[PDB]
Design a protein around this ligand. Structure first.
Ligand SMILES: O=C(c1n[nH]c2ncc(Br)cc12)N1CCCN(C2CC2)S1(=O)=O
Length: 167
């Protein structure tokens, strides 16, 4: 039993809800919140900009130190950093950004990072400003993640479409 509330169950291990991931994280304080990161951990917009803003820029400060030490992530890769006031940990995961020409096949590799964590609150990888089809992202999620994932979809119109079209 966990504290996530109001989710629709899609599969044995994947759950979905129309919710703002920032407000969901603040309420649940999950062990792991997933950020829709880029390789530079520059949290300017989309999910990342919103999560960072909610930490009062502490996520960005921590991220800049991480990059100064380690260099950029790989597309499809991840790192574990603090969750600040939102979660115990933040798993920064880099899905391919279609608006940069990156290979959509890397989306499966990106979701594989979720399997290192028993339970996660997460957005759909590569959706929103990363330019991929969210229906496809949900399909890859369900077919790749084996751990328990609670997906927050900000747009109510998109949420209804994802549910109604889910196979
Ligand atoms: O939640 C957001 C989101 N995008 N910009 C934001 N700004 C502030 C806050 Br708070 C949340 C967001 N989505 C990111 C894109 C992928 N998803 C869409 C496809 C269904 S999403 O995972 O629903």
């Amino acid at each position: 039993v966990n504290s996530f509330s109001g989710y629709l169950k899609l599969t044995d291990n994947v759950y979905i809800k129309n919710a703002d991931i920032v407000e969901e994280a603040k309420k649940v304080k999950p062990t792991v919140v997933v950020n829709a990161a880029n390789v530079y951990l520059k949290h300017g917009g989309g999910v990342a900009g919103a999560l960072n803003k909610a930490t009062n820029n502490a996520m960005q400060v921590e991220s800049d130190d991480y990059i100064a030490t380690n260099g950029p992530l790989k597309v499809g890769g991840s790192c574990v950093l603090s969750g600040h006031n939102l979660a115990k940990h933040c798993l920064h995961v880099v899905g391919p950004n279609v608006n940069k020409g990156e290979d959509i096949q890397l989306l499966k590799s990106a979701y594989e990072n979720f399997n290192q964590h028993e339970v996660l609150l997460a957005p759909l990888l590569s959706a929103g400003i990363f330019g991929a089809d969210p229906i496809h992202s949900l399909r890859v999620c369900v077919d790749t993640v084996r751990t328990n994932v609670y997906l927050a979809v900000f747009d109510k119109n998109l949420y209804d479409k994802l549910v109604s079209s889910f196979l």
